[PDB]
Tab-separated table of C-alpha atoms and ligand atoms in Angstrom:
chain	number	residue	atom	x	y	z
A	1	UNK	CA	-126.051	90.233	54.465
A	2	UNK	CA	-128.522	88.735	51.962
A	3	UNK	CA	-129.831	90.975	49.186
A	4	UNK	CA	-132.558	90.472	46.569
A	5	UNK	CA	-131.441	90.296	42.949
A	6	UNK	CA	-134.312	91.699	40.934
A	7	UNK	CA	-135.375	91.156	37.381
A	8	UNK	CA	-138.553	90.710	35.355
A	9	UNK	CA	-139.716	87.177	34.596
A	10	UNK	CA	-142.799	85.166	33.711
A	11	UNK	CA	-144.165	83.697	36.940
A	12	UNK	CA	-146.441	81.227	35.111
A	13	UNK	CA	-143.456	79.855	33.177
A	14	UNK	CA	-141.489	79.437	36.391
A	15	UNK	CA	-144.162	77.130	37.807
A	16	UNK	CA	-144.284	75.061	34.649
A	17	UNK	CA	-140.486	74.815	34.702
A	18	UNK	CA	-140.519	73.489	38.264
A	19	UNK	CA	-143.197	70.945	37.387
A	20	UNK	CA	-141.160	69.889	34.332
A	21	UNK	CA	-138.142	69.083	36.566
A	22	UNK	CA	-140.254	67.195	39.112
A	23	UNK	CA	-142.731	65.374	36.802
A	24	UNK	CA	-140.454	62.530	35.605
A	25	UNK	CA	-139.631	61.676	39.205
A	26	UNK	CA	-143.317	61.869	40.212
A	27	UNK	CA	-144.049	59.547	37.271
A	28	UNK	CA	-141.543	56.977	38.515
A	29	UNK	CA	-143.046	57.117	42.000
A	30	UNK	CA	-146.517	57.003	40.419
A	31	UNK	CA	-147.637	60.220	42.125
A	32	UNK	CA	-150.073	62.251	40.071
A	33	UNK	CA	-149.295	65.951	40.416
A	34	UNK	CA	-151.424	68.940	39.401
A	35	UNK	CA	-150.702	72.650	38.987
A	36	UNK	CA	-153.397	75.284	39.410
A	37	UNK	CA	-152.746	78.960	38.752
A	38	UNK	CA	-155.441	81.364	39.907
A	39	UNK	CA	-157.187	83.337	37.119
A	40	UNK	CA	-155.894	86.556	38.684
A	41	UNK	CA	-152.305	85.404	39.167
A	42	UNK	CA	-149.960	88.032	37.687
A	43	UNK	CA	-147.885	86.764	34.774
A	44	UNK	CA	-144.966	89.174	34.390
A	45	UNK	CA	-143.513	90.065	37.754
A	46	UNK	CA	-140.481	91.741	39.305
A	47	UNK	CA	-138.555	89.754	41.895
A	48	UNK	CA	-135.679	87.389	42.583
A	49	UNK	CA	-136.227	84.523	40.142
A	50	UNK	CA	-133.463	82.216	41.285
A	51	UNK	CA	-134.420	82.505	44.948
A	52	UNK	CA	-138.116	82.079	44.224
A	53	UNK	CA	-137.286	79.034	42.154
A	54	UNK	CA	-135.305	77.518	45.031
A	55	UNK	CA	-138.299	77.896	47.376
A	56	UNK	CA	-140.851	76.369	45.017
A	57	UNK	CA	-138.508	73.572	43.908
A	58	UNK	CA	-137.738	72.451	47.420
A	59	UNK	CA	-141.351	72.492	48.608
A	60	UNK	CA	-142.774	70.758	45.548
A	61	UNK	CA	-139.786	68.411	45.665
A	62	UNK	CA	-140.473	67.571	49.299
A	63	UNK	CA	-144.039	66.600	48.445
A	64	UNK	CA	-142.737	64.088	45.916
A	65	UNK	CA	-139.920	62.917	48.165
A	66	UNK	CA	-142.036	62.297	51.277
A	67	UNK	CA	-145.100	60.866	49.574
A	68	UNK	CA	-145.283	57.134	48.950
A	69	UNK	CA	-148.652	57.117	47.201
A	70	UNK	CA	-151.541	59.462	46.437
A	71	UNK	CA	-151.543	62.760	44.610
A	72	UNK	CA	-149.872	66.148	44.981
A	73	UNK	CA	-151.422	69.534	44.245
A	74	UNK	CA	-149.583	72.785	43.677
A	75	UNK	CA	-151.780	75.860	43.895
A	76	UNK	CA	-150.633	79.411	43.161
A	77	UNK	CA	-152.800	82.407	44.009
A	78	UNK	CA	-152.884	85.961	45.282
A	79	UNK	CA	-153.160	86.945	48.948
A	80	UNK	CA	-154.788	90.362	49.037
A	81	UNK	CA	-153.361	92.658	51.719
A	82	UNK	CA	-147.191	98.088	42.575
A	83	UNK	CA	-146.811	94.761	44.362
A	84	UNK	CA	-148.808	91.739	45.455
A	85	UNK	CA	-148.447	88.655	47.609
A	86	UNK	CA	-147.992	85.378	45.804
A	87	UNK	CA	-149.346	82.412	47.734
A	88	UNK	CA	-148.205	78.892	46.940
A	89	UNK	CA	-149.782	75.861	48.616
A	90	UNK	CA	-148.337	72.401	48.147
A	91	UNK	CA	-150.507	69.595	49.479
A	92	UNK	CA	-149.189	66.040	49.488
A	93	UNK	CA	-150.470	62.628	50.468
A	94	UNK	CA	-147.743	61.544	52.892
A	95	UNK	CA	-148.114	59.775	56.231
A	96	UNK	CA	-148.678	63.094	58.001
A	97	UNK	CA	-146.505	65.075	60.408
A	98	UNK	CA	-146.782	64.822	64.230
A	99	UNK	CA	-147.605	68.128	65.929
A	100	UNK	CA	-144.458	67.916	68.092
A	101	UNK	CA	-142.299	67.754	64.953
A	102	UNK	CA	-143.669	70.842	63.194
A	103	UNK	CA	-142.139	73.603	65.404
A	104	UNK	CA	-138.638	72.270	64.733
A	105	UNK	CA	-139.108	71.624	61.024
A	106	UNK	CA	-137.041	74.623	59.926
A	107	UNK	CA	-134.184	73.758	62.342
A	108	UNK	CA	-134.141	69.940	62.152
A	109	UNK	CA	-130.319	69.805	61.738
A	110	UNK	CA	-130.361	66.246	58.263
A	111	UNK	CA	-131.665	68.529	55.500
A	112	UNK	CA	-131.228	72.167	54.412
A	113	UNK	CA	-134.043	72.973	51.970
A	114	UNK	CA	-136.560	74.582	54.310
A	115	UNK	CA	-133.934	76.486	56.302
A	116	UNK	CA	-132.774	78.126	53.074
A	117	UNK	CA	-136.362	78.713	51.897
A	118	UNK	CA	-137.197	80.457	55.176
A	119	UNK	CA	-134.366	83.005	54.696
A	120	UNK	CA	-135.517	83.641	51.122
A	121	UNK	CA	-139.155	84.052	52.164
A	122	UNK	CA	-138.064	86.474	54.889
A	123	UNK	CA	-136.102	88.432	52.264
A	124	UNK	CA	-139.324	88.779	50.285
A	125	UNK	CA	-141.157	90.081	53.378
A	126	UNK	CA	-143.216	86.883	53.466
A	127	UNK	CA	-144.430	84.025	55.643
A	128	UNK	CA	-143.908	80.278	55.300
A	129	UNK	CA	-145.294	77.399	57.351
A	130	UNK	CA	-146.152	73.725	57.226
A	131	UNK	CA	-149.274	72.122	58.630
A	132	UNK	CA	-150.667	68.621	58.897
A	133	UNK	CA	-153.963	67.173	60.089
A	134	UNK	CA	-151.988	64.158	61.354
A	135	UNK	CA	-151.777	60.424	60.693
A	136	UNK	CA	-152.393	59.494	57.065
A	137	UNK	CA	-153.363	63.020	56.081
A	138	UNK	CA	-150.177	64.259	54.400
A	139	UNK	CA	-149.290	67.912	54.901
A	140	UNK	CA	-149.579	71.284	53.230
A	141	UNK	CA	-146.644	73.628	52.864
A	142	UNK	CA	-147.658	77.233	52.270
A	143	UNK	CA	-145.805	80.439	51.647
A	144	UNK	CA	-146.638	84.071	50.864
A	145	UNK	CA	-143.972	86.274	49.257
A	146	UNK	CA	-144.095	89.840	47.995
A	147	UNK	CA	-143.499	90.410	44.270
A	148	UNK	CA	-143.594	93.434	41.984
A	149	UNK	CA	-145.954	93.588	39.044
A	150	UNK	CA	-144.283	94.445	35.728
B	1	LIG	N1	-143.823	67.453	52.299
B	1	LIG	C1	-143.345	66.930	53.452
B	1	LIG	N2	-143.872	65.845	54.056
B	1	LIG	C2	-143.397	65.317	55.198
B	1	LIG	N3	-142.340	65.828	55.830
B	1	LIG	C3	-141.721	66.923	55.313
B	1	LIG	C4	-142.183	67.543	54.079
B	1	LIG	N4	-141.397	68.599	53.804
B	1	LIG	C5	-140.490	68.651	54.800
B	1	LIG	N5	-140.686	67.644	55.675
B	1	LIG	C6	-139.913	67.397	56.915
B	1	LIG	O1	-139.108	68.543	57.174
B	1	LIG	C7	-137.740	68.154	57.245
B	1	LIG	C8	-136.906	69.275	56.676
B	1	LIG	O2	-137.152	69.293	55.274
B	1	LIG	P1	-136.063	70.032	54.358
B	1	LIG	O3	-135.554	71.253	55.076
B	1	LIG	O4	-136.690	70.232	53.027
B	1	LIG	O5	-134.860	68.955	54.391
B	1	LIG	P2	-134.787	67.444	53.826
B	1	LIG	O6	-135.867	67.206	52.818
B	1	LIG	O7	-133.397	67.442	53.329
B	1	LIG	O8	-134.905	66.573	55.054
B	1	LIG	C9	-137.663	66.864	56.437
B	1	LIG	O9	-136.535	66.059	56.764
B	1	LIG	C10	-138.987	66.215	56.813
B	1	LIG	O10	-138.971	65.608	58.122
B	2	LIG	CL1	-146.712	63.999	55.272
């Protein structure tokens, strides 16, 4: 039933906007957070801005929410496979995630963010997953989504 709503927007600006919403909260929790955009990351793109924003906001937001100390990095780059694949990696410094808990992370229902993000990523012909090296190692949430180049 779901359908992409396409328009042209500045992808770089979208990342800075997300960081601007999250930063004051990171500051209160004393979690340094960094954004890195690859030198070849397209600027003006065609895609569904409000759905892309929802995905990035919930994953970056989760990093802040579930981290008690340490830093967070948000990295945006291109996955080579007109269109391209945007990759976003969000690495936090949480307590880590047990292997048994990862396969059910998109279906854990308290909490709706990742379930919604998964549908949006699927709409953009993409892939999303979370991984953790275990105790004390935080986790990385990663997604690839297809976007048009303006
Ligand atoms: N960055 C993260 N660090 C640790 N656990 C996470 C992270 N992101 C998601 N999770 C786990 O996945 C579950 C589902 O997350 P989400 O769908 O965003 O819902 P919510 O944040 O409301 O719980 C969370 O409750 C949590 O157990
Ligand atoms: Cl974690």
